[PDB]
Design a protein around this ligand. Structure first.
Ligand SMILES: Cc1cc2nc3c(=O)[nH]c(=O)nc-3n(C[C@H](O)[C@H](O)[C@H](O)COP(=O)(O)OP(=O)(O)OC[C@H]3O[C@@H](n4cnc5c(N)ncnc54)[C@H](O)[C@@H]3O)c2cc1C
Ligand SMILES: Cc1cc2nc3c(=O)[nH]c(=O)nc-3n(C[C@H](O)[C@H](O)[C@H](O)COP(=O)(O)OP(=O)(O)OC[C@H]3O[C@@H](n4cnc5c(N)ncnc54)[C@H](O)[C@@H]3O)c2cc1C
Ligand SMILES: Cc1cc2nc3c(=O)[nH]c(=O)nc-3n(C[C@H](O)[C@H](O)[C@H](O)COP(=O)(O)OP(=O)(O)OC[C@H]3O[C@@H](n4cnc5c(N)ncnc54)[C@H](O)[C@@H]3O)c2cc1C
Ligand SMILES: [Fe+3]
Lengths: 337, 265, 467, 233
């Protein structure tokens, strides 16, 4: 038989706040709304762990989402993500507060920091989960895709605490901000011997290269419906609103508007993005053979008898020259009024 | 540098997998199993460092005796020696028990200046055996390495990527690295190396008797905190929706869809 | 000669035979129907008709024979020699609406297709039924009847052959509207003249194919590739007679030099798995079990290591196969991305003369200061050769293209090869066919087109016409 | 049953070099001609295969695939013909089918219609109903893998006026039945002078006008072998 643990000692659900020198990743706010949903099943509080150098004034931003306690570690050695000061602090945080569950994001920092501390406690950890269900006996039920997404798997961690789980970005929604914030911040400390590291950071350089089409998961594709080359400036500002790579059909290559590595189809790249927006493209068999395995296809075309609508998940019939600049004014509307 | 360990795994030959609705076990089409493509980038990263530093390369695998084929496959690409971790008490393991028996087999094989794990497998997709293995070894680790800028005999200068930045780090030996997809193009297994003896190496197998911690509570299914409850196909649905009526009647429907998919555009 | 221009009374009489939504006149033709992938000649038809049946084609050919209007049939517009371009601008029959696979006979291992079934959707259909259509031209969006009319062959021709070896029967429509069935679901044929073998390779100058019966093979399960480096292209091409005589016949034999591979690395962004050598031989073996594929490649790999190969690399995995074959599959697009424009040569030579012709294009490229990249299939002798314009001006490019093409077609004449082995003659290669074959050889070809088409209406000035 | 196994044999990816069907009444001719019995004639129809290869284990994987397939689809037995003396005991019978038919009759006239492969058994059973009705002997064999059927009408002891009436009726009904089966006049031997009328019945006049206009291109003065194939059909 197996020795049992008392799960009454471990209470609270901690969201590790992901940030890059102060600017919080949006995966943190989606996990707060999920943690407040999961901890309402069991009656536990919701915690937030904060690690950095000059970020103690970013703590009451966490209080405006409903977080009960914001534990802030604000030592000068926590500027860039090195694993040994970050894992020693997260191990020190578990030894003091003893949470029941720790939710971190699926970022490359969260996919690196969470396994280092889960192996230190010999506790369970599930990867890039999509569904989180809480049981009333304090057991998190983590559903995650596996085999490249070909099956889903139900994982549970019944003995060890705190149970770790990494959550995929833009799966859950951020909650509405509270009008009055409750809770407090807690300034924590740690000795300087725990914050040394063999790895030292040279510099953190911004990615300043354009991604190739086969690696992109969002793509704005243009066709012969775009008349002149200066209309691409209206399209290039639209694709950076959603982060999309601008691609084209073979009439776009013959006019010289794009590099030949930006062509989608049999004579170009075969792509599988998460979202493709076809602008003025009739779904010809040479173009559609390189993009039919997209997970979501939006088509904007004036002709309703175009063959792109036989494969498009969202088929919009209309002119793109009146939709997209008017939609770009709808981008500034709900965002900046 | 000099001593380099590469952790490789045998995976199913294809990931096109579906479950029987009441077997509970995977409907795998066949067993033409292979070395996983993410560990080919880890093997190729060791080959570029051996051509610059001149040391040796050891391959390490954990699985059944069928996993000896990917140890012979790494030999045809240019590995110097291999080690299997085949035992009945090691099966059924999750990440915490796999990274423990891989770290126990590392201490049995001596010291290494660098351990190179791949980004992820193709059956588990957890991408976290590497960071858990370096915790049991006590060595520093850097994940998602796209570029090695310097290859000094004491340490490496690496380029670790995030979603939007490039961290440049100087990590010393001993350390673990986790390379990701398309760091280099992996070389092909040579048939000329296959005809040497069968290959020179002669895989050294280790069991639980050979480990420095010979206690089966920390290995296999007994040392696993997690377990699968059920596996099921993912529910996906294709909905064809049309939108007519021009003006901003379509632009509110396009912004309503782009915000529902959290693109915010 | 004597061609009647299409007038408005001919539009009304055509729209009585065809529904008016499949007839296009004037400004609703489209620029894509004025050319094909040759790109040099541009010519609009006066009427574009998208036919749907054999009896609709025969009613159009009866009208054009009566009213003396030229007719050009068009598939996907994919051919590279200007064969589907309507130089006199009459009727253009367009077959991509007849994309129905009519019957799959699993007893006779045949498939009956309509003209306009694409090669990508036929080979997908028969492989779902554990069957196999062996001819593989490089463009999969081609019409099947376009492959029959051009005798389109590809990578698998060393083991399986070309489109001619797999056409069992044809239903053709002559220029006067007569419907003729040519073959059938039979296997052996010795009844009369093989009129079916005249239509294969005729490029729409004799009749309009309105049905095809294609021979299928049982589909092989396993597939393994071998990558063999060599010191030069002379050692790489010389191993091919030893490979075939060892009775382990590869599915594909491709030579690629290092200069062509450097284009595909720049285009795809990924390096080739091993480019420490100047020439390569890329093999492919197929079979039904893993053990008989392993006996096939180990025969050739033990052979190739004994005649000066540096190594033999095993390509056995779907990720390893995509790392090597997407480089070979992007050879054509990498050459196009590196130049302003180019021109294509597809001479076939005897297989023992492959290395001397590839070395001749290297001496020609240094002499004329043009970039001449080349590749091809080492198992049959077909070489895909490209003269790249790069940065020459229009007067200097036309003089350098004409000199480089004339000397390469004259050298293939000396090597006892032909003008084209894959792509056909069409409009572009007509004068090189008059240099290779005599005037008496082309008078036989022109007298055969006078038999099938005495009014000269089906595709005028193509292949033999005015060579 | 013998003609029906041929699609299942080819779809099993073990392609034989030769696929021959032979019925018992044709084998009894070759036994009287050669003076030797066939190794097993306890059945009415036979399929005679041939596999080739480079090693013994490659041929052994080929023939055991088909032999397991035949025994699972209603074959009475599968006999292995592996040695030189065993091959010469079976293939000298097949090689002497034509001479045994000629030795048993006064004179004969032949037919080499090719049909679609799934129509082989219906045509062979048609020649048995035709031989029983016209009271002539029609022995037949052929290649079961491609549809070509070698069919012989024997005059036996018929008088000269009765033979030309029965030969014309038996040949006209067999060439019309192969027309209905969507086959051709000849698959091996050709048209020549003898089969010109049946080529004009199978193909139209527009089909033979294309053939005659091609001979007018190669030979305008009509000197190279006139009145043959597509001439005076
Ligand atoms: C051998 C071969 C290979 C090829 N390979 C490729 C390949 O790999 N990739 C590729 O992309 N192409 C390829 N092509 C070209 C292919 O035919 C093209 O897909 C097609 O010809 C043109 O694509 P398009 O939709 O951009 O142009 P069109 O079809 O001409 O685009 C017009 C469409 O846009 C709509 N439209 C027009 N104005 C507007 C407006 N203001 N607002 C909204 N909608 C509007 C029209 O209703 C129509 O549906 C190949 C062609 C050949 C012959
Ligand atoms: C459907 C499914 C879901 C699972 N979900 C979880 C889960 O949520 N949490 C959990 O803890 N476990 C989980 N497991 C268990 C675990 O992921 C695997 O069973 C096994 O431990 C392989 O590890 P991995 O695929 O996670 O390795 P990864 O972390 O995906 O691979 C990282 C690298 O580690 C090395 N490596 C990994 N495994 C081995 C090995 N056996 N031998 C040598 N080197 C190796 C390789 O270099 C590899 O590139 C799951 C298993 C399955 C089948
Ligand atoms: C990128 C690329 C790669 C290629 N690779 C190869 C290759 O590897 N091998 C190769 O052989 N070819 C290759 N080709 C060209 C090859 O000829 C064409 O792909 C194809 O054979 C032409 O088919 P289509 O449907 O494109 O024909 P079209 O060009 O439209 O027609 C070609 C000819 O066929 C005639 N035709 C078409 N349909 C009929 C019909 N029903 N009846 C009578 N005549 C008809 C036309 O009139 C014209 O004479 C390639 C082309 C491209 C662009
Ligand atoms: Fe070719």
């Amino acid at each position: 038989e197996k020795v049992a643990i008392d799960k009454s000692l471990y209470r609270g659900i901690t969201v590790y706040v992901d940030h890059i020198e102060g600017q919080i990743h949006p995966v943190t706010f989606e996990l707060i709304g999920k943690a407040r949903e999961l901890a309402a099943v069991i009656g536990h509080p919701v915690y937030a762990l904060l690690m950095g150098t000059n970020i103690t004034e970013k703590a009451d931003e966490l209080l405006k989402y409903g977080v009960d306690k914001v534990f802030v570690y604000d030592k000068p050695e926590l500027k860039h993500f090195v694993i040994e000061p970050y894992a020693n602090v997260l191990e020190d945080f578990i030894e003091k507060v003893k949470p029941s569950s720790i939710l971190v994001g699926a970022t490359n920092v969260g996919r690196s920091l969470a396994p280092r501390v889960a192996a230190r406690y010999r506790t369970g950890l599930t990867a890039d989960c999509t569904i989180l269900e809480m049981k009333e006996n304090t057991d998190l039920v983590q559903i995650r895709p596996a085999f490249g997404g070909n099956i889903m798997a139900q994982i549970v961690t019944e003995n060890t605490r705190p149970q770790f789980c990494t959550v995929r970005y833009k799966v859950f929604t951020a909650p509405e901000r509270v009008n009055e914030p409750w809770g407090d911040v807690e300034m924590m400390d740690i000795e300087k011997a725990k914050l040394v590291s063999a790895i030292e950071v040279m510099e953190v350089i911004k990615k300043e290269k354009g991604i190739d089409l086969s690696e992109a998961e969002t793509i704005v594709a243009v066709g012969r419906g775009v008349k002149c080359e200066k209309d691409l400036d209206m399209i290039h500002e639209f694709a950076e609103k959603i982060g999309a790579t601008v691609a084209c059909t073979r009439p776009g290559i013959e006019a010289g508007w794009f590099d030949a590595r930006l062509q989608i189809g049999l004579s170009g790249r075969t792509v599988k993005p998460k979202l493709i927006i076809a602008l003025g493209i009739s779904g010809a068999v040479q173009f559609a053979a390189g993009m039919q395995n997209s997970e979501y296809i939006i088509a904007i075309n004036s002709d309703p008898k175009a063959p792109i609508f036989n494969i498009a998940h969202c088929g919009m019939v209309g002119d793109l020259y009146e939709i997209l600049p008017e939609l770009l004014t709808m981008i500034e509307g709900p965002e900046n009024n | 540098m000099s001593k380099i360990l590469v952790c490789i795994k045998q995976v199913p030959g294809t990931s096109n997998v579906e479950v029987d609705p009441e077997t509970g076990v995977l409907i795998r089409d066949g067993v033409e199993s292979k070395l996983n493509p993410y560990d080919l980038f880890g093997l190729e990263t060791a080959f570029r460092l051996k051509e610059q530093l001149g040391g040796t390369i050891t391959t390490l695998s954990m699985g059944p005796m069928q996993s000896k084929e990917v140890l012979m496959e790494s030999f045809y690409m240019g590995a110097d020696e291999g080690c299997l971790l085949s035992d009945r008490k090691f099966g059924g393991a999750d990440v915490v028990a796999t990274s423990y028996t891989l770290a126990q087999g590392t201490k049995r094989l001596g010291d290494f200046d660098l351990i190179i794990c791949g980004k992820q497998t193709t059956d588990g997709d957890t991408a976290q055996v590497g960071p858990e293995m370096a915790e049991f070894l006590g060595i520093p680790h850097v994940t998602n390495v796209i570029k090695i800028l310097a290859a000094d005999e004491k340490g490496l200068t690496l380029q670790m990527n995030m979603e939007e930045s490039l961290e440049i780090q100087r990590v010393p030996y001993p350390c673990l690295i986790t390379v990701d997809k398309d760091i280099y193009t992996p070389r092909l297994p040579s048939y000329k190396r296959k005809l040497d003896i069968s290959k020179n190496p002669e895989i050294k197998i280790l069991t639980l008797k050979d480990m420095y911690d010979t206690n089966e509570k920390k290995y296999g299914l007994s040392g696993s905190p997690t377990q699968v409850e059920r596996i099921f196909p993912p529910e996906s649905n294709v909905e064809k929706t049309s939108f007519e009526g021009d003006g901003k009647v379509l632009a509110k429907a396009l912004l309503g869809i782009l915000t529902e998919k959290k693109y915010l555009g | 000669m004597n061609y009647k221009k299409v007038e408005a009374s001919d539009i009304a009489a055509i729209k009585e035979l065809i529904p008016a939504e499949r007839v296009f006149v004037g400004t609703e033709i489209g620029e894509d129907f004025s050319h094909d992938e040759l790109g040099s000649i541009h010519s609009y038809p006066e009427v574009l008709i998208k036919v749907t049946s054999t009896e609709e084609v025969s009613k159009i050919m009866k009208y054009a024979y009566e009213h003396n209007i030229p007719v050009v049939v068009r598939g996907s517009g994919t051919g590279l020699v200007g064969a589907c371009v309507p130089l006199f601008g009459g009727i253009m029959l367009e077959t991509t609406l007849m994309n129905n696979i009519l019957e799959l006979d699993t007893e006779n291992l045949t498939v009956t297709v309509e003209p306009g079934v694409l090669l990508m959707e036929l080979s997908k259909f028969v492989e779902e039924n554990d069957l196999f259509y062996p001819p593989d031209p490089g463009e999969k969006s081609a019409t099947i009847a376009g492959n029959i009319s051009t005798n389109a062959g590809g990578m698998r021709a060393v083991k399986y052959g070309v489109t001619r070896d797999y056409v069992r029967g044809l239903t053709v429509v002559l220029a006067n509207g007569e419907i003729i069935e040519l073959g059938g679901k039979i296997v052996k044929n010795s009844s009369g003249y093989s009129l079916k073998d005249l239509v294969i390779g005729s490029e729409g100058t004799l009749c309009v194919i309105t049905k095809a019966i294609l021979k299928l093979l049982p589909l092989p399960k396993m597939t393994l590739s071998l990558l063999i480096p060599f010191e030069n292209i002379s050692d790489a091409a010389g191993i091919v007679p030893k490979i075939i005589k060892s009775k382990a016949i590869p599915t594909a034999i491709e030579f690629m030099e290092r200069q062509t591979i450097l284009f595909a690395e720049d285009f795809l962004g990924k390096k080739f798995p091993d480019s420490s050598s100047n020439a390569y031989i890329l093999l492919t073996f197929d079979g039904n079990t893993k053990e008989q594929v392993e006996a096939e490649y180990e025969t050739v790999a033990n052979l190739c290591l004994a005649e000066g190969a540096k190594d033999v690399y095993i390509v056995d995995t779907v990720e390893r196969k995509d790392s090597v074959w997407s480089a070979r599959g992007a050879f054509l697009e990498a050459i196009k991305a590196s130049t302003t424009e180019m021109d294509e040569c597809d001479v076939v030579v005897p297989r023992n003369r492959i290395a001397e012709f590839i070395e001749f294009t290297h001496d020609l490229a240094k002499e004329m200061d043009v970039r001449i990249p080349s590749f091809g299939h080492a198992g049959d002798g077909n070489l895909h050769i490209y003269v790249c314009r790069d940065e020459l001006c229009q007067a200097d490019w036309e003089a350098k293209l004409a000199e480089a093409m004339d000397r390469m077609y004259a050298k293939a004449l000396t090597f006892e090869g032909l003008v084209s082995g894959e792509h056909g003659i069409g409009y572009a290669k007509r004068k090189y066919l008059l240099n290779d074959f005599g005037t008496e050889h082309l008078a036989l070809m022109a007298g055969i087109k006078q038999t099938f088409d005495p009014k000269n209406l089906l595709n005028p000035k193509k292949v033999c016409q005015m060579a």
